[PDB]
Design an enzyme around this catalytic site. Sequence first.
Site, PDB file in Angstrom:
ATOM      1  N   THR A  99     -19.887  -8.358  19.769  1.00 58.61           N
ATOM      2  CA  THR A  99     -19.348 -10.015  20.232  1.00 58.61           C
ATOM      3  C   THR A  99     -21.168 -10.831  20.626  1.00 58.61           C
ATOM      4  O   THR A  99     -20.417 -11.812  20.341  1.00 58.61           O
ATOM      5  CB  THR A  99     -18.879  -9.874  21.667  1.00 58.61           C
ATOM      6  OG1 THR A  99     -17.651  -8.679  21.290  1.00 58.61           O
ATOM      7  CG2 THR A  99     -17.659 -10.683  22.308  1.00 58.61           C
ATOM      8  N   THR A 100     -21.953 -10.709  20.901  1.00 59.99           N
ATOM      9  CA  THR A 100     -23.260 -11.013  21.300  1.00 59.99           C
ATOM     10  C   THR A 100     -23.371 -11.499  19.886  1.00 59.99           C
ATOM     11  O   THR A 100     -24.531 -12.198  19.925  1.00 59.99           O
ATOM     12  CB  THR A 100     -23.909  -9.609  22.447  1.00 59.99           C
ATOM     13  OG1 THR A 100     -23.683  -8.809  23.243  1.00 59.99           O
ATOM     14  CG2 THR A 100     -25.275 -10.707  22.574  1.00 59.99           C
ATOM     15  N   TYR A 132      -6.135 -11.478  20.869  1.00 62.73           N
ATOM     16  CA  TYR A 132      -4.988 -12.045  20.706  1.00 62.73           C
ATOM     17  C   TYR A 132      -3.545 -11.853  20.322  1.00 62.73           C
ATOM     18  O   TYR A 132      -3.032 -12.776  21.132  1.00 62.73           O
ATOM     19  CB  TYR A 132      -5.567 -13.142  19.695  1.00 62.73           C
ATOM     20  CG  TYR A 132      -4.195 -14.547  19.404  1.00 62.73           C
ATOM     21  CD1 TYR A 132      -4.218 -15.451  20.300  1.00 62.73           C
ATOM     22  CD2 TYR A 132      -4.256 -15.104  17.853  1.00 62.73           C
ATOM     23  CE1 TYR A 132      -3.075 -16.219  19.990  1.00 62.73           C
ATOM     24  CE2 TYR A 132      -3.380 -15.797  17.732  1.00 62.73           C
ATOM     25  CZ  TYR A 132      -2.692 -16.365  18.952  1.00 62.73           C
ATOM     26  OH  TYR A 132      -2.191 -17.776  18.349  1.00 62.73           O
ATOM     27  N   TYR A 153     -14.488   0.331  21.306  1.00 62.62           N
ATOM     28  CA  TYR A 153     -14.762  -0.850  22.312  1.00 62.62           C
ATOM     29  C   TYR A 153     -13.610  -1.651  22.765  1.00 62.62           C
ATOM     30  O   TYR A 153     -12.797  -2.278  22.323  1.00 62.62           O
ATOM     31  CB  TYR A 153     -15.519  -1.566  21.657  1.00 62.62           C
ATOM     32  CG  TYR A 153     -16.008  -3.145  21.716  1.00 62.62           C
ATOM     33  CD1 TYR A 153     -16.618  -3.102  23.056  1.00 62.62           C
ATOM     34  CD2 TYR A 153     -16.842  -3.925  20.875  1.00 62.62           C
ATOM     35  CE1 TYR A 153     -17.058  -3.424  23.436  1.00 62.62           C
ATOM     36  CE2 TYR A 153     -17.602  -5.474  21.339  1.00 62.62           C
ATOM     37  CZ  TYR A 153     -17.620  -5.006  23.180  1.00 62.62           C
ATOM     38  OH  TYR A 153     -17.205  -6.940  23.150  1.00 62.62           O
ATOM     39  N   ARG A 164     -11.216 -10.676  26.988  1.00 65.19           N
ATOM     40  CA  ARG A 164     -11.804 -10.929  25.786  1.00 65.19           C
ATOM     41  C   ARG A 164     -10.901 -10.808  24.857  1.00 65.19           C
ATOM     42  O   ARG A 164     -10.672 -11.476  24.224  1.00 65.19           O
ATOM     43  CB  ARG A 164     -12.677 -10.174  25.120  1.00 65.19           C
ATOM     44  CG  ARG A 164     -14.468 -10.853  26.271  1.00 65.19           C
ATOM     45  CD  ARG A 164     -14.060 -12.135  26.027  1.00 65.19           C
ATOM     46  NE  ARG A 164     -15.955 -12.605  26.490  1.00 65.19           N
ATOM     47  CZ  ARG A 164     -17.217 -12.810  26.190  1.00 65.19           C
ATOM     48  NH1 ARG A 164     -16.740 -12.946  24.960  1.00 65.19           N
ATOM     49  NH2 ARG A 164     -18.011 -13.277  25.966  1.00 65.19           N
ATOM     50  N   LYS A 168     -16.907   2.223  23.682  1.00 65.59           N
ATOM     51  CA  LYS A 168     -18.599   0.839  24.887  1.00 65.59           C
ATOM     52  C   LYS A 168     -17.274   0.573  25.555  1.00 65.59           C
ATOM     53  O   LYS A 168     -16.507  -0.295  25.014  1.00 65.59           O
ATOM     54  CB  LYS A 168     -18.515   0.052  23.655  1.00 65.59           C
ATOM     55  CG  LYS A 168     -19.386  -0.869  24.650  1.00 65.59           C
ATOM     56  CD  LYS A 168     -19.907  -1.814  23.445  1.00 65.59           C
ATOM     57  CE  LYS A 168     -20.854  -3.086  23.975  1.00 65.59           C
ATOM     58  NZ  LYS A 168     -20.209  -4.620  22.948  1.00 65.59           N
ATOM     59  N   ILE A 203     -24.742  -0.206  25.428  1.00 65.18           N
ATOM     60  CA  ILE A 203     -24.806  -1.523  23.818  1.00 65.18           C
ATOM     61  C   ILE A 203     -24.940  -2.305  24.727  1.00 65.18           C
ATOM     62  O   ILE A 203     -24.430  -3.148  25.140  1.00 65.18           O
ATOM     63  CB  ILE A 203     -23.723  -1.460  23.210  1.00 65.18           C
ATOM     64  CG1 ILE A 203     -23.730   0.045  22.165  1.00 65.18           C
ATOM     65  CG2 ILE A 203     -23.900  -2.509  21.996  1.00 65.18           C
ATOM     66  CD1 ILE A 203     -21.897  -0.228  21.564  1.00 65.18           C
TER      67      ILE A 203
HETATM   68  N1  LIG Z   1     -16.662 -11.061  11.477  1.00 64.57           N
HETATM   69  C1  LIG Z   1     -16.258 -12.695  11.092  1.00 64.57           C
HETATM   70  C2  LIG Z   1     -15.277 -12.665  10.355  1.00 64.57           C
HETATM   71  C3  LIG Z   1     -13.916 -13.673  11.605  1.00 64.57           C
HETATM   72  C4  LIG Z   1     -12.723 -14.064  11.535  1.00 64.57           C
HETATM   73  C5  LIG Z   1     -12.265 -15.137  12.929  1.00 64.57           C
HETATM   74  N2  LIG Z   1     -12.572 -15.520  12.962  1.00 64.57           N
HETATM   75  C6  LIG Z   1     -10.392 -14.928  12.257  1.00 64.57           C
HETATM   76  C7  LIG Z   1      -9.660 -13.497  11.777  1.00 64.57           C
HETATM   77  C8  LIG Z   1      -8.137 -13.936  11.876  1.00 64.57           C
HETATM   78  N3  LIG Z   1      -8.313 -12.548  12.001  1.00 64.57           N
HETATM   79  C9  LIG Z   1      -7.996 -14.447  10.504  1.00 64.57           C
HETATM   80  C10 LIG Z   1      -6.851 -14.771  10.881  1.00 64.57           C
HETATM   81  C11 LIG Z   1      -6.306 -16.187   9.637  1.00 64.57           C
HETATM   82  C12 LIG Z   1      -5.558 -16.684   8.822  1.00 64.57           C
HETATM   83  N4  LIG Z   1      -4.590 -17.144  10.299  1.00 64.57           N
HETATM   84  C13 LIG Z   1      -7.870 -14.812  13.444  1.00 64.57           C
HETATM   85  O1  LIG Z   1      -8.311 -16.206  13.152  1.00 64.57           O
HETATM   86  O2  LIG Z   1      -6.833 -14.575  13.951  1.00 64.57           O
HETATM   87  C14 LIG Z   1     -12.048 -13.657  13.661  1.00 64.57           C
HETATM   88  O3  LIG Z   1     -12.246 -12.098  13.134  1.00 64.57           O
HETATM   89  O4  LIG Z   1     -12.717 -13.373  15.083  1.00 64.57           O
END
Ligand SMILES: NCCCC[C@@](N)(CC[C@](N)(CCCCN)C(=O)O)C(=O)O
Lengths: 297, 296, 296, 295
Positions: free
Chosen positions: D44-45, D108, D134, D139, D163, D204
């Site tokens: 996250t950091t 999410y 973790y 968050r 963690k 961490i």
């Molecule tokens: N660590 C590098 C990649 C980061 C990608 C992403 N921004 C989005 C992840 C994702 N699963 C992407 C889905 C895209 C299609 N809608 C999300 O947004 O939930 C996340 O994981 O926070």
Amino acid sequence: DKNIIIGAMTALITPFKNGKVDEQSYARLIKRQIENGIDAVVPVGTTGESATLTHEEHRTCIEIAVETCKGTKVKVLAGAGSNATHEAVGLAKFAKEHGADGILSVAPYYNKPTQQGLYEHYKAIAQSVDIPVLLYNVPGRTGCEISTDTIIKLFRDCENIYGVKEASGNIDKCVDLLAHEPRMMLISGEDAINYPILSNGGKGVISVTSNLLPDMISALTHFALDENYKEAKKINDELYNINKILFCESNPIPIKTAMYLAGLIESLEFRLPLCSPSKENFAKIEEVMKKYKIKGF
Amino acid sequence: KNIIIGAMTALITPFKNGKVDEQSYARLIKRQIENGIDAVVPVGTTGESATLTHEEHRTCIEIAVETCKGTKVKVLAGAGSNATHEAVGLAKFAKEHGADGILSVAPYYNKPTQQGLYEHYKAIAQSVDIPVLLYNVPGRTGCEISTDTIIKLFRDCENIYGVKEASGNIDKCVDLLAHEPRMMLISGEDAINYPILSNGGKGVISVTSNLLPDMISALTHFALDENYKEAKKINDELYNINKILFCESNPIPIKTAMYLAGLIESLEFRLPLCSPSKENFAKIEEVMKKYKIKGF
Amino acid sequence: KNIIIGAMTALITPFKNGKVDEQSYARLIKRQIENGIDAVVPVGTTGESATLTHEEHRTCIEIAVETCKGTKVKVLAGAGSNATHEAVGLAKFAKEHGADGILSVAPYYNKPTQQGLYEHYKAIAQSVDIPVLLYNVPGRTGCEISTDTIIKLFRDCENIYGVKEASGNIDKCVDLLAHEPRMMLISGEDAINYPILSNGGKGVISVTSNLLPDMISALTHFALDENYKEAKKINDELYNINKILFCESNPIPIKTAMYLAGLIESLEFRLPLCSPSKENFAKIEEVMKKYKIKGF
Amino acid sequence: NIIIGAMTALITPFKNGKVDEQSYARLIKRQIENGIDAVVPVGTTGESATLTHEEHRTCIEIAVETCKGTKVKVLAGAGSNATHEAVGLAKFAKEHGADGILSVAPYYNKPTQQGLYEHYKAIAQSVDIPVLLYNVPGRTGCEISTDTIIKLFRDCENIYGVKEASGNIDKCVDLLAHEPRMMLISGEDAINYPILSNGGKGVISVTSNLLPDMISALTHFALDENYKEAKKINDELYNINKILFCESNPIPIKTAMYLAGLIESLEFRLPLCSPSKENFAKIEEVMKKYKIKGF
Ligand SMILES: NCCCC[C@@](N)(CC[C@](N)(CCCCN)C(=O)O)C(=O)O
Ligand SMILES: NCCCC[C@@](N)(CC[C@](N)(CCCCN)C(=O)O)C(=O)O
Ligand SMILES: NCCCC[C@@](N)(CC[C@](N)(CCCCN)C(=O)O)C(=O)O
Ligand SMILES: NCCCC[C@@](N)(CC[C@](N)(CCCCN)C(=O)O)C(=O)O
């Protein structure tokens, strides 16, 4: 005066078959929404499993929604949210160039931006396209809250930002928004309290329940906009039990299970980390479903 | 079921030199009556129930009953307690001294179970034969009267007729009235008076009406008349004052506003309540200016 | 700065036929004394302070004082109220009748501000000359005594010497002792007694010790001796009983447990408190079988 | 095998919108030279959400290569809210030399406990390196319950701990009273000492970006059962530990690194941005109480 997308709207589920998006089933479900009086559809929101789709699959669902609604009055409010502004901008531009009528843009999840950051996030999005943008507040999923001040400031600084989908179970906030900025379109993102949000001047819903019962949700919504509050409250009261049971496990787990049990989708498939409900909740969902009349195709 | 509904005021309790100013109390109540209020609630949370002795509590109920005696205005007496024997004692006094009904807050601090809540209210209800309104305010009590409990009490006890909801939970209001549309759901949260009434609520017990009784009564009566347009308009205009009256714990801001309006002589509380922070004091003064405050 | 620290018990209040069983009360205290407890706390939350009359409350304090008189066990009297005049009265009574110090819960239900909390405790602390321990339990009261406020009171009032924390907030405990390492931080939450002690807390006021005074006091003394391995070991072993004692609101499970152990004659509470469900009765009984419980 | 002790949730420096790879390497060497036991690239950091998968992969490779001839381990950020993305990152980290992975609970989409279990099971079965769960409910909008963490620890050989960043000391007690064989790792700097005093075996840290010498000393004092010295440093660190969350992490830590001259530009990727002027000054004031090691 802004361009807007309002009325009864459906946060479409995304049916999977053998791990793949079932494209023909997706279009068919959209037509079923259109035939039951829905005013707009929302491809790839939370209910559409936006997190587990690829960016290419996400884009494909949007095209399918546009194509299916083409030549009808039904608008496409495309899911275009992301916790990375560069990703959210990309989705907005695609939605723009492929004929979506607007976009729904969830507040960044996980990285917890500040109110200032939320402002810059949405401003960057709104300036990337010229189509309507609906803000989307759901703190229980994202870990952040777009404040009333921030929402109002975005509405006032960006021409295409026209309202917010609220899923925070906070009717006080709904009063705050509409009392200070009566021009904005407040959209219910919480089915159980559709009626109260409409009776305070809300102008539409983006519904989970409408996947299963689109006729009832659009009736409720249209009764409210016509100021027939007695009839809108009646349906909202009728729908309360299913509106709640559709969240006995995390959405879209119960709604997809319900669509499956109704014979509306062929396969009860999710992508991990989402999975089937317990056998107990499966029975509970079957229990509530049997108490309503469900449209076929 | 006999009921008390409509526009109601949770009366502030004015002190002078640490003692209850009886004459001012009576005058404040007459002012409420002249502005179309349907009922007054002596000694609720807003009336500083916690810091009055049992003697003063009873005296405040008496003044309310006597002041409203030759009028149509009803007295829903504050009668709650976190100890059932105290609550029953209050209920029986109110009954015997002419109160039309009682408001009975959920026990605070000791966190009863739902079963305990049930027995608490059943005990109270069986002690009097006047209407009893339940009162849910979990942010203050540390316990919640659940929807099921509320409905069981409404159905099992003839004199229990509804609940004053101060929980900021419109989902629960929908839950309540969809499963038991016969109960009287009363708003105990000013900012959302309209949304509660528009879902089938039948009244308010208001803090804001101490200051603006005519606007709160007008809002309520528009709503009961299914004139939601007029009700919403007023609820929106009142949002600023409604919220600022809770910039600190009620009834700190309302007594401050009544003082600034010239309706009470002194800004006096009983500890642990005290006058607001000077920042909040200025916010209250500035917001009040937007509104037209009726005199005596 | 005079202090009362170490292993302390939040005493349950046994009822027999609706009345305080005074003989049983004294017997349970002597049991505490004989199992290494450093202090007892008559009439706290665990002691059903809310449903006792002021006279019954005063009686329980006197019994505790008399019973402990010739021993080295201290009486930290429960003297809290949500009304400052009531808490001052209890404080003065406690001083006049031989209490060694007082515990004073934060005002419940009326939600005073930090300024109000400061004046509430300043009034109490100036009314008597015995040690005063503050008590934070926001889950029950609906208010929170901020770290800043606790620290001001500690520095402004000679006899205020620390706080009983029942907030489940280890961050706050770090905050307190980092900025004011001279105050006595006391755990009011059995499950996390050890983490609080290992950060420099100097005692506990326990529910579990009613049933298992030997284990809690051994835990506390091990910690004070900086034998942290032994303290943590007891804390981990006690985790199950520490949590099950809150399957329903305290003191419903602790009294059920004392009854199950044969330590009190009857399973009586005062409304709105009541008996636990048969299910929870069974859970408590099931858990109790894992531990060695001291007799009379 | 396990990865424990004092670890650093590495910030990710940006220059002109791009990851400053040279700066990233210098920052890691600096952690290595200040007694840190492991580094965590792209948690996250490290702005995991706004890096592309390609950039995320690059940061891991840099950490592994920078640590290669040293005793410092690389616990690679490999979490995602999509199980297929998370398995991809896990496999990449394994294949490219990571010593273990850190995997945040899906954010999410709010999976059920069963879903979290299958999520981590699929990840644990994809690689043969240690995996540290973790938990950060504030968050992600979901919590891995104690039961789920314990089942995962017991069912999956390479899942070795969690963690915890949930501000819940009761949970820490619960976890280690029922399963003391797990490695509980503090993900909340302010309460590093309380978690360690209860049997936690490492941290961490966000704060260790700025003050690695102090965080590693605290952790090692604790591990050597010198609780006196560990608490002393935890107390001294309380002001900075809180101020680094006056706005959402990593907004304050990056501001601190920039003010200290440890990174070249105060650059985030939206939706993260610079702190308010007021908080900017607060951070600057607290920093003056601490000695900040150079390169
Ligand atoms: N660590 C590098 C990649 C980061 C990608 C992403 N921004 C989005 C992840 C994702 N699963 C992407 C889905 C895209 C299609 N809608 C999300 O947004 O939930 C996340 O994981 O926070
Ligand atoms: N409305 C007038 C009476 C006020 C009494 C009291 N201050 C205290 C109530 C009490 N049940 C009294 C207990 C006293 C003996 N421990 C409480 O403090 O919980 C309250 O109800 O808030
Ligand atoms: N054999 C030793 C006797 C000790 C007395 C006492 N139990 C206190 C007794 C006391 N509560 C003291 C009150 C005076 C407070 N400063 C009492 O006499 O009742 C104690 O201090 O531990
Ligand atoms: N000359 C001795 C240095 C040891 C190498 C390494 N840094 C890590 C090694 C590794 N990261 C691969 C480890 C694989 C984990 N299962 C590497 O080769 O770079 C370590 O063990 O600490």
